[PDB]
Design a binder for this molecule. Sequence first.
Ligand SMILES: *C(#N)[C]([C][C]1[C][C][N]C1=O)[N]C(=O)[C]1[C][Si]([C])([C])[C]N1C(=O)[C]([N]C(=O)O[C])C([C])([C])[C]
Ligand SMILES: *C(#N)[C]([C][C]1[C][C][N]C1=O)[N]C(=O)[C]1[C][Si]([C])([C])[C]N1C(=O)[C]([N]C(=O)O[C])C([C])([C])[C]
Ligand SMILES: [Cl-]
Ligand SMILES: [Cl-]
Ligand SMILES: [Cl-]
Ligand SMILES: [Cl-]
Ligand SMILES: [Cl-]
Ligand SMILES: [Cl-]
Ligand SMILES: [Cl-]
Ligand SMILES: [Cl-]
Ligand SMILES: [Cl-]
Lengths: 305, 302
Amino acid sequence: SGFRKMAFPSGKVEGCMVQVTCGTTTLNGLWLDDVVYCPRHVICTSEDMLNPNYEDLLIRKSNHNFLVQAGNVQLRVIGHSMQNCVLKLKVDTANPKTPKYKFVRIQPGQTFSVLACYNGSPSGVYQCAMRPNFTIKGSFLNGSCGSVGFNIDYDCVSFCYMHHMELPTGVHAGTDLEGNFYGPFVDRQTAQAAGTDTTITVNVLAWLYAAVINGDRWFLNRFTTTLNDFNLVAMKYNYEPLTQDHVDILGPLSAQTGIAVLDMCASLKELLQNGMNGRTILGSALLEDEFTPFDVVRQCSGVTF
Amino acid sequence: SGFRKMAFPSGKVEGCMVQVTCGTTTLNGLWLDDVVYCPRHVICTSEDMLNPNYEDLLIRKSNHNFLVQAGNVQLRVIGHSMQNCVLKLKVDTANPKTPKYKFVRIQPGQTFSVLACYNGSPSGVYQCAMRPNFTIKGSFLNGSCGSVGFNIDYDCVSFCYMHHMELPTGVHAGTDLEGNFYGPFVDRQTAQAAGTDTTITVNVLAWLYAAVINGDRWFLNRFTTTLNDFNLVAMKYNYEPLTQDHVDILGPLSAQTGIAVLDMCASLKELLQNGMNGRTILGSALLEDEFTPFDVVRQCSG
Ligand SMILES: *C(#N)[C]([C][C]1[C][C][N]C1=O)[N]C(=O)[C]1[C][Si]([C])([C])[C]N1C(=O)[C]([N]C(=O)O[C])C([C])([C])[C]
Ligand SMILES: *C(#N)[C]([C][C]1[C][C][N]C1=O)[N]C(=O)[C]1[C][Si]([C])([C])[C]N1C(=O)[C]([N]C(=O)O[C])C([C])([C])[C]
Ligand SMILES: [Cl-]
Ligand SMILES: [Cl-]
Ligand SMILES: [Cl-]
Ligand SMILES: [Cl-]
Ligand SMILES: [Cl-]
Ligand SMILES: [Cl-]
Ligand SMILES: [Cl-]
Ligand SMILES: [Cl-]
Ligand SMILES: [Cl-]
């Protein structure tokens, strides 16, 4: 049947993307009801990008300094406010394409779909995971800020990420839709480095289950471990700890495949200590950690939206 | 910066996906204007899935044998005709969400986004390429037929694939939107084997250039090669031969990075000869062949 890196359908989010311009700076905004959300650094100027006083910059600004364009129609800004690192521009027209939505904050290891946009126009969609160091290994060029990450739960779009900046290593940092950053980063153009990253162990296990569901079984072995032994091995290899909750969440996959979670942990421990021996798993020579247990179940059961 | 496997936004295609039911068979349809396109095997009976005479089967059908459901509303089928392996159900309502679109047949090596759907509703979007053996390495379950592959230029959707079947290897086969199968496959449940799958060499080279654009350097070397010497080595690794057409296409990436095409070809030969030695390229331990030169330019540049 096959297994692919798959993003949620992006149609609901596409109808909310607009272009936000504060003079020279142009980026994307998320138009929900009568409010447009965008990074607050759009008001920054090259005079002081190093240490911007955002509260005082916004005081100088009036509604007329913000140009919002939805397609080929200009949206009238009738108010503006700042919440954390997101600017909220109130517009005179509610978005007729507003879907059932909610703002959520995700945890490290959870995945989401990113709709990369430029000049308010969606250009691509891809699936990524919030890394344990709170960055995302995205793909973003100039003008991509305001692009959002999201999941879909039943009929409801869950907005979880808005893109703000790129770190010197090529990884990306952003905030939730309340403007609070993921990770210890600030929206200033100064030297900032992401912490050492680690592998999302629970996601690796779920991906191994996806392989077993697809007939890839060479890595299974007779052995089992307990959570204590595996966690000691995992930390030695820069792998995140596996909690009892992670075992519970992997439960349905364990029942489906006949491979207990600690049974699979024995396979993963051998893979870490001995390598792939030239073999591949689902066409990959590395252990994929950007599939949650829910992603694997959803793709192997055909959940739609 | 950063390089990701990236699909086109699927919204323009979501507005066209519908559910098509004939008898006890349900799959997906593509609703463009007043026509719904779906695989013609939706009318195939369980009695004879080996040698179905689809033309004979469709003559015995009436418009009332086809149920089309768009959202919560039922469309009325007012006509039906067959073009190759695709069934065309005319409906009484034109889709108000029909986008600017065209039908294109693609060549091996070309990439496109797939909107996997079930019961007429979008489930997910992913990227894949037409393999050299004319299959695709997709992700499909029961009831996924009718799902389409597409690309988007500006605001125009190029529909290039419709899913029809899964081969015993687990790879997938389908047609263009005019119903013509890619490769030597038929929409019958008969013994069918795909050819040996090979690597899309031009796509690998474009991906190496993408790595260089994104700061990777470790695989570069001082060597170069002739085109024929590169092909002789590469074919021993089940890599597709590289033509002068591929060399020309890689020209813009070559100029941007300052690395000649045959220079990069020498790097590829080294990677095939040596492996990775614990290193990765763009976060991957294998060479990736599902980014075209067009994909690389679009993602890396404006
Ligand atoms: C938006 N639009 C852009 C997108 C960036 C640039 C290329 N790739 C991306 O992801 N983001 C920015 O302009 C932000 C706003 Si700022 C706090 C005035 C600077 N900035 C940055 O991304 C900068 N990086 C940084 O300071 O991280 C420590 C760079 C990339 C411009 C140096
Ligand atoms: C549609 N809907 C399905 C989706 C398939 C089945 C599981 N994974 C997929 O991608 N497609 C089919 O049922 C087709 C139509 Si048919 C000519 C009546 C049989 N078929 C098949 O995929 C079959 N394979 C085959 O005949 O290859 C020669 C199997 C997989 C159902 C035996
Ligand atoms: Cl401040
Ligand atoms: Cl305020
Ligand atoms: Cl993807
Ligand atoms: Cl920018
Ligand atoms: Cl064993
Ligand atoms: Cl999880
Ligand atoms: Cl689950
Ligand atoms: Cl793309
Ligand atoms: Cl035919």
